[PDB]
Amino acid sequence: GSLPKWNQPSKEGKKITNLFVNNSLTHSKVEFIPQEGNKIKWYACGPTVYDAAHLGHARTYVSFDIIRRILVNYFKYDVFMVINITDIDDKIIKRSVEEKIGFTELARKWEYEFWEDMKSLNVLLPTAITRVSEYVGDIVKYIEKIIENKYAYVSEEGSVYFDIDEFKKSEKHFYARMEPLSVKKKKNAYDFALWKSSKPNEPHWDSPWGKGRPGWHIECSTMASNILGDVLDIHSGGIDLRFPHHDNELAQSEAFFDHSQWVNYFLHSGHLHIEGLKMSKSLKNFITIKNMLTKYTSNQIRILFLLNKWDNFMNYSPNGESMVQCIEIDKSFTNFFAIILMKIKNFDLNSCNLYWSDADNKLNLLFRQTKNKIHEHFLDNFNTPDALLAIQKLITEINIYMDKEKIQIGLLLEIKHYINFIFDTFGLIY
Amino acid sequence: SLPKWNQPSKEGKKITNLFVNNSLTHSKVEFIPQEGNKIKWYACGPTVYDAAHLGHARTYVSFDIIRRILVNYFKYDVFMVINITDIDDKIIKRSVEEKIGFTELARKWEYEFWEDMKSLNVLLPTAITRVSEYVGDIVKYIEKIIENKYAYVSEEGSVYFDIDEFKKSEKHFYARMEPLSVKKKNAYDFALWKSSKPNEPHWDSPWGKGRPGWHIECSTMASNILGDVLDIHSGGIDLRFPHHDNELAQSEAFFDHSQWVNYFLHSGHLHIEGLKMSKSLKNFITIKNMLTKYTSNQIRILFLLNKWDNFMNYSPNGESMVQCIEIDKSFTNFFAIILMKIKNFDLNSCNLYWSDADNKLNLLFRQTKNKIHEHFLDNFNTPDALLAIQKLITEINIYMDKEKIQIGLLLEIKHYINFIFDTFGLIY
Numbered sequence: 093g094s095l096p097k098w099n100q101p102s103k104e105g106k107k108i109t110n111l112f113v114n115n116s117l118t119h120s121k122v123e124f125i126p127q128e129g130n131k132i133k134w135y136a137c138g139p140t141v142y143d144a145a146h147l148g149h150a151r152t153y154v155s156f157d158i159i160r161r162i163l164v165n166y167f168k169y170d171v172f173m174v175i176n177i178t179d180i181d182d183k184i185i186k187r188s189v190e191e192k193i194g195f196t197e198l199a200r201k202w203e204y205e206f207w208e209d210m211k212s213l214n215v216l217l218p219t220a221i222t223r224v225s226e227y228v229g230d231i232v233k234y235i236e237k238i239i240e241n242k243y244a245y246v247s248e249e250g251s252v253y254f255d256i257d258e259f260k261k262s263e264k265h266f267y268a269r270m271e272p273l274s275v276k277k278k279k280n281a282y283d284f285a286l287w288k289s290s291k292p293n294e295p296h297w298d299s300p301w302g303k304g305r306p307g308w309h310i311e312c313s314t315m316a317s318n319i320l321g322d323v324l325d326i327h328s329g330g331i332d333l334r335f336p337h338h339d340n341e342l343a344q345s346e347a348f349f350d351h352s353q354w355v356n357y358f359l360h361s362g363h364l365h366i367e368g369l370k371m372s373k374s375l376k377n378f379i380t381i382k383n384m385l386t387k388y389t390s391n392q393i394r395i396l397f398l399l400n401k402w403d404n405f406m407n408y409s410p411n412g413e414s415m416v417q418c419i420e421i422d423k424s425f426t427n428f429f430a431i432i433l434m435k436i437k438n439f440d441l442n443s444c445n446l447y448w449s450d451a452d453n454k455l456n457l458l459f460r461q462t463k464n465k466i467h468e469h470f471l472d473n474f475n476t477p478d479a480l481l482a483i484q485k486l487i488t489e490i491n492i493y494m495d496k497e498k499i500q501i502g503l504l505l506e507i508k509h510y511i512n513f514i515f516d517t518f519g520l521i522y
Numbered sequence: 523s524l525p526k527w528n529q530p531s532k533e534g535k536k537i538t539n540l541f542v543n544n545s546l547t548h549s550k551v552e553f554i555p556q557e558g559n560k561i562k563w564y565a566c567g568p569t570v571y572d573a574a575h576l577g578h579a580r581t582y583v584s585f586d587i588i589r590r591i592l593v594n595y596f597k598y599d600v601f602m603v604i605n606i607t608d609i610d611d612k613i614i615k616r617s618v619e620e621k622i623g624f625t626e627l628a629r630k631w632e633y634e635f636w637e638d639m640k641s642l643n644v645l646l647p648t649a650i651t652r653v654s655e656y657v658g659d660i661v662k663y664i665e666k667i668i669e670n671k672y673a674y675v676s677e678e679g680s681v682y683f684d685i686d687e688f689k690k691s692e693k694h695f696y697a698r699m700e701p702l703s704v705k706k707k708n709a710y711d712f713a714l715w716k717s718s719k720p721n722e723p724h725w726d727s728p729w730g731k732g733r734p735g736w737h738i739e740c741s742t743m744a745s746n747i748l749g750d751v752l753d754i755h756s757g758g759i760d761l762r763f764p765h766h767d768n769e770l771a772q773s774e775a776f777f778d779h780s781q782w783v784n785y786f787l788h789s790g791h792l793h794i795e796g797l798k799m800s801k802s803l804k805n806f807i808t809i810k811n812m813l814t815k816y817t818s819n820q821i822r823i824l825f826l827l828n829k830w831d832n833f834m835n836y837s838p839n840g841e842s843m844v845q846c847i848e849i850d851k852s853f854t855n856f857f858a859i860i861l862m863k864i865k866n867f868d869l870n871s872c873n874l875y876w877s878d879a880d881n882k883l884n885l886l887f888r889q890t891k892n893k894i895h896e897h898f899l900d901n902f903n904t905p906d907a908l909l910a911i912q913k914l915i916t917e918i919n920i921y922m923d924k925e926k927i928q929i930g931l932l933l934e935i936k937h938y939i940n941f942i943f944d945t946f947g948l949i950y
């Protein structure tokens with residue numbers, strides 16, 4: 093009644109870690125519970141490929157790369173991940189007439205550069221990549237099923253529209269679950285296109301309703317449903333996508349499967365702002381990932397994002413201001429590895445005393461305590477800023493111990509391996 | 523008349539449903555940390571008077587695998603201690619024959635031992651406890667046992683553990699793990715302090731110049747670092763009695779409680795032509811000699827193929843290593859192909875539609891992860907986990923040859939197999 097309901101998955105037979113995540117379906121932190129076993133089926137919205145990627149894009153996909161690494165490498169979940177490529181879109185069509193190199197060729201060029209930029213930032217490829225242009229046939233069939241369930245109608249011009257009012261009427265369906273308050277050929281203005289009749293001279297595809305292109309939202313519902321099925325553990329994207337794009341995906345997929353909950357946990361990354369405004373091609377305030385990488389390293393860019401909670405907005409100060417701290421932290425990590433490897437390399441088991449000293453026990457106590465702190469930070473909705481701080485504090489105490497105390501070679505090696513493990517989880521490379 | 527064992531309570535603990543073969547219960551029981559996700563673990567180390575051999579490698583590689591499974595795979599927090607027995611009758615005798623000081627002999631063969639462990643990619647423990655550095659702590663430990671009335675002093679200046687007195691206490695049972703293997707009051711009493719002949723190495727004590735008894739060394743060092751409850755204590759099966767049963771009795775007497783160790787794990791021995799590989803039998807192969815014939819990966823595969831708590835036969839002249847070399851070769855060739863396909867894959871010209879062949883490989887992939895999880899939960903069953911990896915690799919090889927490849931799926935599979943190989947201690 094007027095408020096959307098959410099069904100937490102049952103805990104029986106599932107991997108239970110007590111991880112809590114910020115779920116946009118509940119607008120709260122709730123315990124994460126797999127639909128099945130230790131498995132996480134996860135779809136994340138990808139770029140629309142018509143130009144260079146910028147630092148805002150880097151923030152979203154690095155943030156989700158970090159979260160994936162925590163889920164897999166740290167918590168040992170089994171993550172099946174899908175990212176789409178929006179290679180059919182009005183922006184691409186317009187840009188291709190300007191560039192005169194062919195529509196598929198333009199989209200493929202900027203998709204290729206997007207993946208090169210993700211690789212440069214040490215962002216892992218997903219399990220499956222779903223390009224809209226390779227799924228148009230499956231999209232047409234998806235729309236046919238929604239129409240067959242009477243949740244969409246065909247205009248005379250040959251477009252197909254989702255029927256919001258028919259969908260809401262069903263007691264098992266609620267439209268705009270995540271942003272309820274954000275709501276001539278149509279029945280109602282709030283109805284959105286599933287199939288757009290083709291304008292002349294534009295790229296188009298055949299369908300039962302005439303030549304056209306998919307509507308934006310039906311692309312992601314179709315592709316995610318085809319690979320991951322009727323219940324997604326996680327669906328993600330930047331916060332701007334929550335409405336209309338993600339709310340519309342929920343309605344389409346619910347209408348296709350005729351059920352009530354297509355996604356259990358919807359995660360929305362915050363935006364990178366620059367001088368108070370979202371970094372956007374439109375505002376002409378953006379910094380390309382490639383330009384960023386001529387001045388800073390992959391590690392420094394990832395540290396920038398590790399210092400900001402994934403689901404909050406962050407301010408970026410250009411001309412190196414925000415990167416000053418990132419460069420210092422990266423510098424201290426590089427210097428730490430140099431020192432500890434030198435101490436390990438020069439340690440002589442023949443001439444040492446290995447008595448477990450008071451200093452050895454204190455360092456070990458701080459070490460085990462740091463493991464428990466970082467565990468509680470990761471359970472706390474992927475709090476990397478405080479886990480990074482905990483690592484920095486530990487490195488400060490290891491540096492002191494290496495300078496003066498007689499070293500337990502085994503304790504130093506084990507601590508280095510744990511720090512390596514957390515840095516693999518962060519996506520840092522030393 | 524039969525020893526009792528108390529399973530740790532599950533509240534507030536990391537619970538994985540791992541089952542381990544506990545020599546205290548002579549059965550497989552669920553593993554439960556004493557505190558949180560922590561595992562305090564002490565493992566008996568070598569007696570350092572000569573070169574290490576393939577029997578030693580079997581014990582420490584087997585326990586290195588188990589530690590890697592516990593830490594890398596299950597994400598337990600393992601605090602591990604391995605001792606060095608550098609005071610011993612064998613070291614003393616060997617040092618007089620060679621005409622070198624006992625410390626110089628022990629230090630050299632401890633060094634070679636760690637060099638050989640590193641060559642086999644065996645991780646060092648958190649702490650290394652040498653007897654010669656803990657003698658003062660051993661004396662204090664013995665004083666407390668005497669003060670608790672569980673040990674007495676002979677006229678000669680030795681100290682003996684008092685079995686009959688220990689047994690009488692209702693809270694103490696002597697020889698928990700091998701009950702039937704059982705100047706002094708009774709012959710079964712064992713020395714905590716041996717009065718030294720004036721020509722032997724010796725240390726001062728309240729009872730006169732002497733040396734520690736064998737067993738009190740390990741009780742003292744383990745207690746000093748890890749305390750009154752060990753999650754895990756391990757060693758080869760020969761050490762279960764008298765050495766480990768005597769460690770339990772001493773440490774129980776020192777702390778006056780009933781359970782010093784929750785889970786006692788005993789690796790099986792490597793036999794060679796039916797007899798334990800032993801310096802005494804002159805049937806041994808040094809680790810260095812083995813490594814001039816086989817690689818670290820191949821030697822680790824040999825132990826991965828044999829359950830850690832069963833005995834194994836080693837057939838020399840390459841007979842047992844044929845299979846290990848074939849498996850190592852197939853892992854090498856698999857990684858070569860999957861690494862090149864990932865490196866040379868071109869996103870500009872590929873088609874990435876998720877095909878039925880992609881879906882089949884993925885289902886087998888996720889299914890293999892679950893099989894291997896159940897194998898590790900089943901008392902560190904690396905033989906069946908290794909077989910599951912081989913089967914999966916067979917299907918990935920087919921897919922890479924014929925099907926159009928999902929670059930992301932191959933990359934995820936590569937990372938998972940790497941993760942399992944890091945858990946095994948294999949390096950490709």
Ligand SMILES: Nc1ncnc2c1ncn2[C@@H]1O[C@H](COP(=O)(O)O)[C@@H](O)[C@H]1O
Nearest residue numbers: 105106107129130168538539891892895
């Ligand atoms: N690392 C893992 N790999 C595969 N399955 C897991 C893992 N952790 C938990 N599970 C599954 O989660 C369910 C319950 O977890 P547990 O009670 O921790 O064994 C079981 O069906 C397991 O198969």
Ligand SMILES: Nc1ncnc2c1ncn2[C@@H]1O[C@H](COP(=O)(O)O)[C@@H](O)[C@H]1O
Nearest residue numbers: 139140148149151152329330363364371
């Ligand atoms: N300035 C930004 N900060 C963080 N994420 C962004 C930014 N701009 C776009 N994104 C995300 O990157 C993805 C691509 O969006 P688009 O800007 O339409 O190419 C979406 O999930 C967006 O929410």
Ligand SMILES: Nc1ncnc2c1ncn2[C@@H]1O[C@H](COP(=O)(O)O)[C@@H](O)[C@H]1O
Nearest residue numbers: 109110463464467534535536558559597
């Ligand atoms: N990877 C880990 N690192 C540190 N502590 C852990 C880890 N996993 C579980 N624990 C601890 O084990 C206790 C119970 O685990 P659980 O109920 O599975 O969260 C909690 O107090 C946790 O702090």
Ligand SMILES: Nc1ncnc2c1ncn2[C@@H]1O[C@H](COP(=O)(O)O)[C@@H](O)[C@H]1O
Nearest residue numbers: 568569577578580581757758791792799
């Ligand atoms: N042949 C063997 N196979 C497996 N483990 C052995 C073998 N010989 C010795 N060990 C183990 O290696 C450690 C050192 O024993 P030692 O032979 O006294 O130096 C002990 O825990 C033994 O149980």
Ligand code: NA
Nearest residue numbers: 260262263265
């Ligand atoms: Na409704």
Ligand code: NA
Nearest residue numbers: 332333335336
């Ligand atoms: Na929005």
Ligand code: NA
Nearest residue numbers: 689691692694
């Ligand atoms: Na008794």
Ligand code: NA
Nearest residue numbers: 760761763764
């Ligand atoms: Na024995």
Ligand SMILES: [Zn+2]
Nearest residue numbers: 137138312337
């Ligand atoms: Zn989308």
Ligand SMILES: [Zn+2]
Nearest residue numbers: 566567740765
């Ligand atoms: Zn011992």
